Design a protein around this ligand. Structure first.
Ligand SMILES: Cc1cc2nc3c(=O)[nH]c(=O)nc-3n(C[C@H](O)[C@H](O)[C@H](O)COP(=O)(O)OP(=O)(O)OC[C@H]3O[C@@H](n4cnc5c(N)ncnc54)[C@H](O)[C@@H]3O)c2cc1C
Ligand SMILES: Cc1cc2nc3c(=O)[nH]c(=O)nc-3n(C[C@H](O)[C@H](O)[C@H](O)COP(=O)(O)OP(=O)(O)OC[C@H]3O[C@@H](n4cnc5c(N)ncnc54)[C@H](O)[C@@H]3O)c2cc1C
Ligand SMILES: COc1ccc2c(c1)C(=O)C(c1ccc(N)cc1)=[N+]2[O-]
Ligand SMILES: COc1ccc2c(c1)C(=O)C(c1ccc(N)cc1)=[N+]2[O-]
Ligand SMILES: [Zn+2]
Ligand SMILES: [Zn+2]
Lengths: 229, 229
């Protein structure tokens, strides 16, 4: 069997992102996978990294260091329950799909907060214990992104540069760092500009890709893959 | 005269980031600049992009589109006061310094939320009306970042790649997109590993640089600057 967590970041159920998340649930459910969705806006997910994330006696209450305190809280089981609830979903998953609209060449802040707070030291990585030695080794991750900009804008000679350039902090700096193997991104370009048929086509391309997702190999998550030369 | 806004994202006043923000206030105040600080954690700044960002009635209450709603709310003066308070600070500033610890090769979510919610359509850019036609042309921006990783890790052949690789979404996709001219980043590597004297040196280098900040030329914010030789 296979277990999938979809971390979804869109405010509107009727959105293009909503449709891509729903087709993923529908297709992976049809295959017999175990599927969980973390709908961050509906959960009112807390994005801020604060001292409210630790319940116990702080390691250094005089000078608050978020990374030190969360690492110690993870080991002591004194983290806030909203974080540990997400960590259980990630621990059980074989594949984590992130479904989101691109905001400033990155994830919306609510989803950035999920990465900041859930992927803590001791859970997702250790120093040492990162990149190929990351604690989430054996798991797959996939970014399914939608954009305002067209595919042409997202080219080497386009005004936004190649789309792989903006993937570096997410695929490499975050997911590969935690040990994930990264599947090729799904980028659904400019659905707002797209015709009704073109939008339908992008939703079906995603559903069709998911039919054979378990046969895919991960990308080589390197600087050469992202930037060339 | 010169006006500066510092957007600061650290939970702890006694932190290394706190010291870099304080020396920036001290030095720019000494020069006679007008200085404002947005201390996002102390403000409990809201990072989530939600329908609470629009006061009164929505353009389309049946299907919520954040970008459409905020663009229309900006034009109709119906944005939440926390957003318009930041927009006034940015509008008045000649230079915007962002002071933050690197979180997942990017800004902490609270600061990502400031970028998502404050730099709205009609205020910072329009569609079309971006990059050289962005609405913050004439302003300068500067990223002052601290890291966990050493300078050696942030090299082309280092495990994290060149530090310029992670700057692309922030400097190009966000700041340049809105029309800012981007000053060279200030990167304070691994202060937690550094000695007491080493950290004092990093703080002093930032204060010293600020003495001549108004004489600096911006970087060429291009793909070649970020990814080339
Ligand atoms: C703060 C902010 C920052 C941004 N920064 C960037 C950036 O850096 N770069 C960039 O390129 N873009 C950026 N954008 C734009 C953003 O990425 C796009 O608006 C977003 O990706 C569009 O996806 P969506 O789901 O919201 O589209 P929607 O507006 O929800 O979808 C478009 C259309 O598809 C229709 N649709 C829904 N479901 C289906 C279906 N099943 N079949 C057919 N049609 C369907 C909808 O009804 C609608 O008409 C930014 C936006 C914001 C708000
Ligand atoms: C969610 C998360 C994600 C992260 N992702 C990344 C990543 O992608 N890449 C990466 O490289 N790092 C990453 N980090 C690490 C993070 O960037 C560093 O921990 C941070 O930059 C350290 O800066 P600081 O201000 O918090 O240091 P502090 O711990 O506050 O500073 C270290 C010391 O400086 C002392 N000090 C304060 N002021 C002075 C002064 N004036 N003179 C001398 N000493 C002084 C303090 O007392 C303290 O002992 C991440 C951390 C977290 C929590
Ligand atoms: C905040 O940054 C952004 C917001 C919305 C955006 C973008 C950046 C785009 O680049 C884009 C966009 C939409 C249509 C065409 N023709 C081009 C770009 N939208 O919507
Ligand atoms: C979330 O990603 C991160 C968090 C903290 C980090 C890093 C990444 C490092 O790479 C690092 C780090 C710590 C000690 C030595 N010797 C090197 C790097 N810290 O602290
Ligand atoms: Zn990688
Ligand atoms: Zn640029």
């Amino acid at each position: 069997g296979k277990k999938v967590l979809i971390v979804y970041a869109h405010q509107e159920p009727k959105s293009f992102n909503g449709s891509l998340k729903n087709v993923a649930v529908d297709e992976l459910s049809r295959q017999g996978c175990t599927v969980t969705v973390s709908d961050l806006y509906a959960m009112n997910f807390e994005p801020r990294a604060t001292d409210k994330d630790i319940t116990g006696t702080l390691s250094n209450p005089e000078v608050f260091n978020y990374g030190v305190e969360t690492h110690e809280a993870y080991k002591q089981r004194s983290l806030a329950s909203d974080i540990t609830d997400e960590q259980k979903k990630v621990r059980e998953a074989d594949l984590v799909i992130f479904q989101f609209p691109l905001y400033w060449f990155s994830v919306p802040a609510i989803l950035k907060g999920w990465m900041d707070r859930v992927l803590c030291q001791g859970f997702a990585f250790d120093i040492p214990g990162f990149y190929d030695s990351g604690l989430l080794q054996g798991k797959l991750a996939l970014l399914s992104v939608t954009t305002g900009g067209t595919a042409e804008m997202y080219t080497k000679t386009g005004v936004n540069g190649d789309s792989r350039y903006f993937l570096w902090p997410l695929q490499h700096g975050t997911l590969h760092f935690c040990g994930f193997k990264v599947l090729a991104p799904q980028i659904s370009f400019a659905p707002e500009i797209a015709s009704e048929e073109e939008r339908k086509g992008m939703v079906a391309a995603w559903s069709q890709r998911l039919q054979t997702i378990w046969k895919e190999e991960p990308i080589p998550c390197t600087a050469h893959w992202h930037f060339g030369q």
